[PDB]
């Protein structure tokens, strides 16, 4: 895949903190389908390193439990751009955020052979915030996405999105 | 939505013979999110009978099979406006066609709308049809959509969207 648009001007340490996973789109619908299926994953918060790294911790479900999980996230030359250390990298790609509202983010899947990419539009507040998916949506047309999800606020307040 | 112009003068023998399901839509995640949820379903043919009702042929994974499945659509007072007694829905709505490439409908159980509500594209043609997708995107924008699934030509072509 080519990713097209990632953040000019990313300050990372201005997304420390909570947030919430209001709505997700990967390029296979086998990627978000079930909720156990690999990329549906829901991010609850950012902590930037002071060495400019990013630590994402997550939720997921797994065995039918939800899981906790920490995914550190190492700065590259392209600042809007890190690499997950994991038996296989992956890439993690800011497209745009106003720091106080949303983020949006994409994800690939490299332990899949076949060209793979999850994007999510994360806001602050438990809230679905008509003008971040309307950021997400305009984001998501330049990208071959197969399969859509959003979250109601019910969703967002639970653990692992119920 | 309000009853539109293609909509009252809809003509349903128009729309007889070959579709695909390009597209699909729930207010449910749980409606549409496995191959054997309940409103996954993929339309092949429409055949309108002389007394105005609506046969729709379609495939839907059951069983560990690919079943094909006859619905018979009774017609209503509005034109647009089906009766069916199947996939535990009672409405089958069509919002638009040009009859000759693209042709947008939703099925829901009027008891309960929000937890019912499923809407596909259906094309002529085994393609991905960027302005039916288009057309298909604007209607859903007034919805209360929450999963959204797109299919690729090899997935058209196959049985069950393979």
């Given at each position: 895949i080519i990713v097209t648009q990632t953040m000019k001007?990313?300050?990372?340490?201005?997304?420390?903190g909570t947030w919430y996973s209001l709505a997700m789109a990967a390029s296979d619908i086998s990627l978000l389908?079930?909720?156990?299926?690999?990329?549906r994953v829901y991010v609850e918060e950012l902590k930037p390193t002071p060495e400019g790294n990013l630590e994402i911790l997550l939720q997921k479900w797994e065995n039918g439990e939800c899981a906790q999980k920490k995914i550190i996230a190492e700065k590259t030359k392209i600042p809007a751009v890190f690499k997950i250390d994991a038996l296989n990298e992956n890439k993690v790609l800011?497209?745009?955020?106003?720091?106080k509202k949303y983020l949006l983010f994409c994800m690939e899947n490299?332990?899949?052979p076949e060209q793979s990419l999850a994007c999510q539009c994360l806001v602050r507040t438990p809230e679905v915030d008509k003008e971040a998916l309307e950021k997400f949506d305009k984001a998501l047309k330049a990208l071959p996405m197969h399969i859509r999800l959003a979250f109601n606020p019910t969703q967002l307040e639970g653990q692992c999105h119920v």
């Open positions: 001007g990313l300050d990372i340490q201005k997304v420390a389908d079930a909720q156990s299926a690999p990329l800011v497209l745009d955020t106003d720091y490299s332990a899949e």
